[PDB]
Structure 1
């Protein structure tokens, strides 16, 4: 519980390394063995009026009844499995927060990526934190303020950039997700896979 605090205007997150190399390797191995990713029609989204396969693999796990929707795609959560419960329980232990849902994004290499968005779901519990736990290759994670994007922005607030390491936890606390977009940009020189888990408190 030594945390790096990430502060900017309307930005309140914190970052720590939860697990040492050997433990994070074991957890990564088990994630690779056990996680089942969506394919085909459940891996296409619509943005700007055009449909695309997502440039990564995704999976959702959580309590019965929950659903998760973004960009024209609805995902239903698979029942919890031991490796995800273990990570969930550790994260809750260390933060005092609870979660009933996890979105998993796997980036096979640096060309897999995710575009800019806020985690402002309707189904998301108002004011609840999001716990982002990473395994595998380090990848750069980028926060941009809502008012600073476009050719002429309302304001020019500085972008915030963090490398997210193997075994790390990034807590995204209110009001981070009302004011800041985030993304995981392409990093061509990264050749190895990364699995990210974002634990959330969803409304049934």
Structure 2
């Protein structure tokens, strides 16, 4: 099979070309369940979730998910639409610090994603906004219902990877992953409770 499903702790080199190594690292249980329960409640209630207008392939649409931003915002993104808050919620500051102290990598930008139910999603894309630089390090922490993080390798051989992201799981993407792969979170065809995802990035001048 040209497809792999990964739900185990580990470091995975999913491809070595054409750009270089694409690496994803999975840490299930990074936040234990009872603390993850409490974090989910606080973020659900306190983050200023909005359904925002997006563009993809130069055309404007309402995203099928709620979002909010903290810290730095990727430079080609609209400040007026995305409303990034320079004041981090204390739970989000704690989680930022925990991820940084444990992974050794720093971040200055946070996109909060809320998938309200199975009809919410994000379509195929790469995190290749240019103010992220070449080969960015991106950390993803999930709470709430499990949803699937799908990956597909771009054309010029396992060429598809699926990662269920369950409650308290940390995912890191680094290396050539954004140059050589796309990812999405598909809609589901059975009921899903809400999911909150936190995606931490570094935005540069």
Q: Indicate whether the TM-score tops 0.5.
A: yes
State how far apart, in whole Å, the 2-side matches of 1:146 and 1:107 are.
26
Question: More displaced, 180-189 or 118-127?
Answer: 118-127
SS at match of 1:52: strand
Aligned 8 A contact 1:24 1:167 in 2? yes
Deviations 1:113-153 (A, max 9, x none): 00000001111143331001000000011010111xxxxxx
Aligned to 2:173: 172
Q: Tell me if 1:52 matches 2:61.
A: yes
Deviations 1:66-122 (A, max 9, x none): 455459x95241121101101101100110000011011110011100000000111
From 26, 29, 37, the equivalent of 2:41 is 29
Q: Structure 2 matches for 1:10-25, cutoff 5 A?
A: 10=16, 11-17=22-28, 18-25=30-37
State how far apart, in whole Å, the 2-side matches of 1:9 and 1:36 are.
37
Give the direction of change, closer, same or farther, for the CA distance of 1:139–1:68 in structure 2 (3 Å limit).
Answer: farther
Aligned to 2:19: none
Aligned 8 A contact 1:67 1:74 in 2? no
Aligned to 1:122: 130
From 105, 111, 114, the equivalent of 1:103 is 111
Aligned 8 A contact 2:135 2:178 in 1? no
Give the direction of change, closer, same or farther, for the CA distance of 1:134–1:68 in structure 2 (3 Å limit).
Answer: farther
* TM value normalised by structure 2: 0.85
Give the direction of change, closer, same or farther, for the CA distance of 1:146–1:74 in structure 2 (3 Å limit).
Answer: farther
Gaps of 5+ in 1: 148-153
CA RMSD of aligned residues (A): 2.1
Aligned to 2:5: none
SS at match of 1:123: helix
**Aligned-residue offset at 1:162:** 0.8
SS at match of 1:110: coil
Q: Tell me if 1:203 matches 2:190.
A: no
Aligned to 2:162: 161
State how far apart, in whole Å, the 1-side matches of 2:84 and 2:58 are.
26
SS at match of 1:132: strand
Q: Tell me if 1:38 matches 2:47.
A: no
